[model samples]
Target: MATLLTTDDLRRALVESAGETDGTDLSGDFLDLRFEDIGYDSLALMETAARLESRYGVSIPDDVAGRVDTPRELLDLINGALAEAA
Candidate 1:
């Protein structure tokens, strides 16, 4: 079985891709929250997706972007993409 991506993993990816030197500001407590609630705009989300794609050696199709609106949603997409890669 393919391992699913965690909320912390997605948070770190967002923090890193946003060029935040310190990722301490981001928390995993509210991962189920909407992306905008955590200050993640479309650009940040896309950058994070690119980072995830490179890290997992998977392609995140454009349609997946439209399907995700929260960190939890992002995890689902990443898990699906990871499954595809496997």
Candidate 2:
């Protein structure tokens, strides 16, 4: 059984990639927040995607990438991609 990725996983990765050391918690605070305010950009997202790609052995398609903004949306796309790959 493979380990399933959760939003918290994504949040942690994003936090790391953003170079934030404030111990901020983005797992449950992304409902009305923008990635920009959270110190996230396209480059950070790409880095996060690369990490996820290596972790899950799944590629993030451009279409899916283009549609994600919040962590919830990103998490859904990642799980959807994993499901499709599975």
Candidate 3:
């Protein structure tokens, strides 16, 4: 079974993929915040998704990547897939 993806993992992927946005503290409670509000554009999210896919050995489709609006949603999607795969 694959390991469960945690919020910290997602945060690392976001920073690695697109770097931390100025004035945005991803280290805090940012899960419910929209990506746009957190200064992450769709491209940034797609890049982050790609990073997660590689690290987790999971497939995150382009459409799914584009649809996730917040960190919580992305986490849910990824963990759900991981659960199913296991």
All predictions: root-mean-square deviation over Cα?
2.6, 2.5, 1.7
Instruction: List where candidate 2 sits over 4 angstroms from the true fold.
Output: 1-3, 20-24, 27-32
Put down candidate 3 lDDT per residue, 1-86, tens digits, no spaces.
Answer: 57887878888878777655556567865688898887777787788878877867788788888888888898888888787776
Q: Which scores better on lDDT, 1 or 3? A: 3
Stretches of candidate 1 exceeding 4 Å from the true structure: 1-3, 21-25
Give each model's whole-structure lDDT. 0.72, 0.71, 0.79
lDDT digits (tens) for residues 6-85 of candidate 2 = 65787777777766756556756564666766666677777877788788888886556645677667777777778877
At residue 64, candidate 1 shows an lDDT of 67
The residue pairs that clash in candidate 3, if any, are none
Q: What TM-score, computed on C-alpha atoms, does each candidate reach?
A: 0.76, 0.75, 0.85
The local distance difference test score of model 1 is 0.72
Model 3, residue 37: C-alpha shift (Å): 0.4
Report the alpha-carbon TM-score of model 2 versus the true structure.
0.75
Q: Identify the leading candidate in terms of TM-score.
A: 3
The positional error of residue 23 in candidate 2, measured at the CA in angstroms, is: 6.5
| Per-prediction tally of clashes | 0, 0, 0
Give, for candidate 3, the lowest lDDT window spanning 10 residues.
17-26
Candidate 2 accuracy as lDDT = 0.71
